[PDB]
Each structure stands twice: as structure tokens, then as C-alpha cells.
């Protein structure tokens, strides 16, 4: 019931937020169901470049909507963000360096694929969850 859209990336910003163009207009996308470290902050400039990484190495980046919300009320995208065919908000999550986050009914559809990742991380006492 979801589907993967294309799109280019256009420049990496912090670890849940990317410029990409989309539908040829360029828009600032927030990844949902997650929330990084600000730059700022404790694991945030590995957040970033960890995002960074995984979108400016893809051949191919997606953009994927859930079912609710696909603007917030920033003018920011909210989608499931792919590069080659790998969700980056899962695989922070994966990671240890985002948090699930920000879980508002009907934008959940990936909800419990994140949380399992987080469980994992946590277990092994990945970065965030390494205190
Ligand atoms: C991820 C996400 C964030 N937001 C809003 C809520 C938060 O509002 P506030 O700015 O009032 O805190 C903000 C969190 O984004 P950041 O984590 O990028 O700051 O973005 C949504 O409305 N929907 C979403 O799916
Ligand atoms: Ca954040």
C-alpha cells in the first residue's frame, strides 16, 4: 500500500533531514518515525554523516509517503527516504544514532520495523545506547 518514488539527491543537511529534488522541485525531507541528535548535541555529527554517507554513495535515492501527513508544518517532506533499496531511517535507527521519534497516527505504516530496530541496537549497546 506504499510506494517508492524517485527522486536526486540535491545535498545532505544533519542526520534526519535532506535536500532532495522531488517531482523536480527541491524540498527539504525530515525522515519520519525517527529523531538523530542535533548536530550539536551528544552522537549528532554522527548522526550526520552517517545519513550523509548512505544518500551521497546511492545510485538511487526514493522517497517513500506514508498514508497521513506528507508536509509538516515546516514545509518539510515526510517520507521513508531509500538509497539503493535501503531505508536510511531504519538503518539509523539500526544504528543507534536515532531514536524512534515522532510516531503520529496514520504516518506509522514502518512503526514496528523501527522498533525492532531500536531493541536491537539497544541490546547491543549501539552508540546512543552505549551510556
Ligand atoms: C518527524 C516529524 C516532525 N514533526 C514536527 C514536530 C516537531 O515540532 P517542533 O519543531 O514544534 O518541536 C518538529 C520535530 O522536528 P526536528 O526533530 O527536525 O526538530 O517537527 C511533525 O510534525 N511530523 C513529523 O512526522
Ligand atoms: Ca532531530
Same mark, same amino acid.
Given at each position: ?10 545535498? !545532505? ?17 525530515? +525522515? ?23 544518500? *551521497?554513495?546511492?545510485?538511487?535515492? *526514493? ?19 531509500? !538509497? ?5 531511517? *531504519? ?5 543507534? +544514532? !536515532? ?33
Amino acid at each position: 500500500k506504499l510506494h517508492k518514488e524517485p527522486a536526486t539527491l540535491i545535498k !545532505a543537511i544533519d542526520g534526519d533531514t535532506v535536500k532532495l529534488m522531488y517531482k523536480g522541485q527541491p524540498m527539504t525531507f525530515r +525522515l519520519l518515525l525517527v529523531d538523530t541528535p542535533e548536530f550539536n548535541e551528544k552522537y549528532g555529527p554522527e548522526a550526520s554523516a552517517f545519513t550523509k554517507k548512505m544518500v *551521497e554513495n546511492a545510485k538511487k535515492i *526514493e522517497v517513500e509517503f506514508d498514508k497521513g501527513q506528507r508536509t509538516d508544518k515546516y514545509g518539510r517532506g515526510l517520507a521513508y527516504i531509500y !538509497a539503493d533499496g535501503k531505508m536510511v531511517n *531504519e538503518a539509523l535507527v539500526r544504528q543507534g +544514532l !536515532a531514536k524512534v521519534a515522532y510516531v503520529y497516527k496514520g504516518n506509522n505504516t514502518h512503526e514496528q520495523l523501527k522498533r525492532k530496530a531500536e531493541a536491537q541496537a539497544k541490546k547491543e549497546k549501539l552508540n546512543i545506547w552505549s551510556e
